[PDB]
Nucleic acid binder design. Structure first.
Lengths: 222, 100, 92, 73
RNA sequence: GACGGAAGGGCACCACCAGGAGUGGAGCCUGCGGCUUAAUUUGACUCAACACGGGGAAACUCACCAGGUCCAGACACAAUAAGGAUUGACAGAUUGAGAGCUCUUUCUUGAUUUUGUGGGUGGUGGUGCAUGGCCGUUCUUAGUUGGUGGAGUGAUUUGUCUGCUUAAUUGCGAUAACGAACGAGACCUUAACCUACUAAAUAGUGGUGCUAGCAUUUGCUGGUUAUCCACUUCUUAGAGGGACUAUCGGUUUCAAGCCGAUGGAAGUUUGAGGCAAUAACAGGUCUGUGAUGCCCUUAGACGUUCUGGGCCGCACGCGCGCUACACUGACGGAGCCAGCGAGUCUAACCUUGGCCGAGAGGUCUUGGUAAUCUUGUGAAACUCCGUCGUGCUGGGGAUAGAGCAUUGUAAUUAUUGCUCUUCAACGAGGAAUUCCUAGUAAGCGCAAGUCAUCAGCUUGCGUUGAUUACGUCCCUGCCCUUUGUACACAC
């Protein structure tokens, strides 16, 4: 009905609305992203989470409630908007889930240094190429301080930082204020399967195959 | 009948593979068809100040969203028309059906 | 503040019909979606229900998505005396 | 947040909420007989024919007709 | 480490032999500082505020100002109590009305309601010197950091460096260092050259479906789809081609590099952008938040019904800018050239008209869910015939009074546009101060942003186009090394 340019802008906006809804409601279960599928007379939203059984509930009661919420937001024909929640593997290789676990650990009350070190160890052993946790705020003092815990090695400039680097910025409400966690995870270029296969500067040399000389006059008679 | 499929997506890779599989299946099915007419790419620009408040140098940024629109005009029986329309459906790419 | 019995029953019966409501942050609209009553009426009544302890709210760009609870539905179910396994509020 | 004098005197004179007076609704006092009516309603159907409407002085005000009711009684 | 009116080397038109364009000279659209009853809201104080808070506002925005004036004990604790708790309501007393703000008196949706707590809500209230995020700036310059080995009791050094180049800790290289990480590059877009792999009634050629001017001479200009043939070698496209200093000279412990000439797109990484170094501002932002912490108010509160006033009072000073000192100009007539830019669905967006006017506006939709419609956006100093013609003139609508109107339920203290007038500054414009390496300076114009209505602003594009730049630190700043220091909130 609406012109296509405004319709796609509204599609992106609605993506952002439901993404905020899922990030704000689906935090405790480690929400880490969505995938919206487009098809004539049917829209599908894939919710990649970790605690997917504890999202689905009994016979998908909660996910059915969520897709009904979206359906009533859009006033679309019931059943057109469908939701499916899947257990995304390697929950450690996701900035959103790692920052959410940081938030939960901090609110639980574990010391910030040990928390950051635990998350960075988990991220490192989970196969991540590089990790960086920046915690900003009041840390055992009344003046703001920032602690940066890094491992591996990341990048900051170019397109590779745009694509490989997954970033999550979370504002944890603590007792004396708000702390800020910036989790920056560099992933593997050869673990994308989309776009560039490797870093634009890191070259891989091809394996040669040696061939023996002739050493003698032979004639292939046929 | 003169049906027409037009697609108005934003992701060029999905756009191109949709077009490629459509034209390749049409060619392997040995029909009569018109080539994919490829309208100019429309770039939506939004120019805004980087700063939330008014302090600092007067620096600006431009966020661009690229829109790719292609279309194909066909004439065929209804059954195979619906078959071609409904197969090879991909998320992110929006397609619609028109006449003449 | 005054809460009309007719509109309260309308909102409760819509909550039992569907299971959840969206309350767009538009006060004085006086023409709610899917309910005849006023938007401020819906929003305040749902906040009253939450404070009573029968439903939870999510804001998500000031839209007021609602979601009922176990005791929240069972209290109203025994209030209206509707029998068990007859009418879940938000059944599949 | 310190410039407030309240020059005008105490203006909190909220109108009363129908204080509980003596037994209201003195319809009539007829033992073993028909209880009559006073200042009866007109031929308008929407009147309840048993509802005690307001009759202050040479005018009638209808409870049902809350907004639009202007008649010469 | 910082600094030095210390030394060496290398850089930068946020710096300069040179030159161009402005400001402070005139007026005016704008933003800042002090008096004003109650208000002329608040933030920002060098570069790194001053056409910035996308802040071009008459409601709202807008919390500032004078005013009537309501609820939230949301949720749970002690109360009368259906012989009842409660909203709202008319010509009749000041508020402008069917704003019961208080009435000489009532009607009355019907358990929804009033006194102190525990925990709260709202706040464009304060704290940005509690903060998160973000952004600007040191410095957008070439610069930061481990591991393992060397040095030193140690702080800490080497690595990260004598020499040689553009922008480069860029490299060649010597070497107590070897091997790495981040920045630079590398990367992703933008404009350029493609007679190719694949193109549509949106950019055409000949016959034609119909017709005219130069004539029976072979063509151009015209005007249209289904009636077709050959192509995107001009608009745009998608596995995509080249440019890497290719080649030829000159110069070197005869090593990286520099300086000159060819089809071809240029041989200053092709030109320009995007995110951008475990370091820091106690720089801005608590006026972008249902982000809170600490205090303010806790039922006449900063939450909010309506009326208005206000960055439109100035005695005044300072800034991006616009129009000008005119005969390289002003005006009158004939030509009259870009696209990335925008566009009604729960009720309108830019405009194609039979009628009227240099003006806005009506009857139907040719425009729609959009390369086909607005729009070749036929938009400006640009090419020719004259008038004004050096005399403060025809450049000033500064300034002020008369009439038509799109918008807004109010354009009155010209919102804005079009018909009419006075003449107050202007003889290379003082101290000072800002930008400019190939189509950039500058001139002139167009589109989006803010919008219920108007650009003098900003972000992008288009037309003509630049002498002194392949130089230097003399001024302002940098980077490295050496050096001195009584500095270390660091001159």
């Amino acid at each position: 009905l609406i012109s296509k340019k405004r319709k796609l802008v509204a599609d992106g906006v609605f993506y952002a609305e439901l993404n905020e809804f899922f990030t704000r409601e689906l935090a405790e279960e480690g929400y880490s992203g969505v995938e919206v599928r487009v098809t004539p007379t049917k829209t599908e939203v894939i919710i990649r989470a970790t605690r997917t059984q504890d999202v689905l509930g009994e016979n998908g009661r909660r996910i059915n409630e969520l897709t009904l919420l979206v359906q009533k937001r859009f006033k679309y024909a019931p059943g057109t908007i469908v939701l499916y929640a899947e257990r995304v593997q390697d929950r450690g290789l996701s900035a959103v889930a790692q920052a959410e676990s940081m938030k939960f650990k901090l609110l639980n009350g574990l010391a910030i240094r040990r928390a950051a070190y635990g998350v960075v160890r988990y991220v490192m052993e989970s196969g991540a190429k590089g990790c960086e946790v920046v915690v900003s705020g009041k840390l055992r003092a009344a003046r703001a301080k920032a602690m940066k815990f890094a491992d591996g090695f990341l990048i900051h400039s170019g397109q590779p930082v745009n694509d490989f680097i997954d970033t999550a910025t979370r504002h944890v409400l603590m007792r004396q204020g708000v702390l800020g966690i910036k989790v920056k995870i560099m992933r593997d270029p050869a673990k994308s399967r989309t776009g560039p296969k490797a870093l634009p500067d890191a070259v891989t040399i091809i394996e040669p195959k040696e061939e023996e000389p002739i050493l003698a006059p032979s004639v292939k008679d046929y | 009948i003169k049906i027409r499929i037009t697609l108005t997506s934003t992701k060029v890779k999905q756009l191109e593979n949709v077009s490629s599989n459509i034209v390749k299946n049409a060619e392997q099915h040995n029909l009569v068809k018109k080539g994919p007419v490829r309208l100019p790419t429309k770039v939506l620009k939004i120019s805004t100040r980087k700063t939330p408040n008014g302090e600092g140098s007067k620096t600006w940024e431009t966020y661009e969203m690229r829109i790719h629109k292609r279309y194909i005009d066909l004439e065929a029986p209804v059954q195979i028309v619906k078959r071609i329309t409904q197969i090879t459906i991909e998320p992110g790419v929006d397609v619609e059906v028109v006449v003449a | 503040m005054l809460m009309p019995k007719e509109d309260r029953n309308k909102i409760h019966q819509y909550l039992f019909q569907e299971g959840v409501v969206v309350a767009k942050k538009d006060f004085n609209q006086a023409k709610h979606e899917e309910i005849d009553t006023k938007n401020l009426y819906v929003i305040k009544a749902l906040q009253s229900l939450t404070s009573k302890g029968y439903v939870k709210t999510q804001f998500s760009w000031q839209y007021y998505y609602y979601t009922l609870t176990e005791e929240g539905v069972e209290y109203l179910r025994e209030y209206l005396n509707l029998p068990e396994h007859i009418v879940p509020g938000t059944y599949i | 947040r310190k410039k407030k004098v309240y020059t005008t005197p105490k203006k909190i004179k909220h109108k009363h909420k129908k204080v509980k007076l003596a037994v209201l609704s003195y319809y009539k006092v007829d033992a073993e007989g028909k209880v009559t009516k006073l200042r009866r309603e007109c031929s308008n159907p929407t009147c309840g024919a048993g509802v005690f409407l307001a009759n202050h002085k040479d005018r009638l005000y209808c409870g049902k007709c809350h907004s639009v009711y202007k008649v010469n009684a």
